[PDB]
């Protein structure tokens, strides 16, 4: 995936080959691991972006996209 | 007293074990066991292959 | 993922955890690695299970699961 | 599948367990490839025939069955 920034937030832009692994990207505070759990395709006009929040020791609920450090934003096409 | 209970109407319900089976065209309409279970809602339809 | 059978063909019980992972599994006829795109949640109550097709040389159309060595099939959650 | 031919060309008759594999047989000219995409079922009574063409370098379309080498009659029957 291409690691970007929103407003001075990471932003991931993932594409069709990396549904299924976890994401790894380094950050002043640590190492960063989001996972995606998302209708995930391929990269297309068809985007959707949103953010995955931080999540510390609480179960995810209503959500398919979190990192265990500092929250990031997500994008991905829904193409196939 | 005690009148009697002429029907019961389900007015709110709830949906598990949802299953799917279909099959290739010209091979016929395909079947699920649970079909002959009356706590099953289930329908059969076509869809391309 | 929990390897259980269905009138002699291979069940997947996949749960949470495995989103976006290639899942393999050991069978007489070799390695099965089955392909998983899916609403993939949390296993409970509220599950759906179908199948994942043999698919050889062929691209996949109008579906997010399939095996490229034996059909098997596959169940999970879609609570979150 | 039996080979067998209709006026001068080569004719196929296509059981149900070839469905899925390429379909190869020698002729004067080199190997012939000739591709079945068809309801493809149960040889029986119910029949279909038709002609499978020759393609050069163009991509098929409206079409289950062609080969790459010299055109080629198939018949398989429908029956489940």
């Given at each position: ?23 790894l990207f380094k950050?002043?505070?640590?190492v960063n691991m ?47 | ?49």
């Amino acid at each position: 995936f291409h690691l970007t920034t929103r407003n001075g937030e990471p932003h991931m832009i993932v594409s069709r080959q990396e549904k299924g692994k976890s994401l790894l990207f380094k950050t002043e505070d640590g190492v960063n691991m989001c996972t995606l759990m998302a209708d995930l395709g391929e990269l297309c006009e068809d985007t959707i972006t949103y953010k995955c929040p931080l999540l510390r020791q609480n179960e995810p609920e209503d959500i398919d996209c979190w990192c265990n450090s500092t929250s990031t934003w997500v994008t991905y096409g829904t193409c196939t | 007293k005690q009148p009697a209970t002429l029907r019961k109407y389900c007015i709110e319900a709830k949906l598990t074990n949802t299953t799917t089976e279909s099959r290739c065209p010209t091979q016929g309409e395909p079947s699920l066991n649970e079909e002959q279970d009356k706590r099953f809602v289930c329908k059969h339809s076509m869809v391309d292959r």
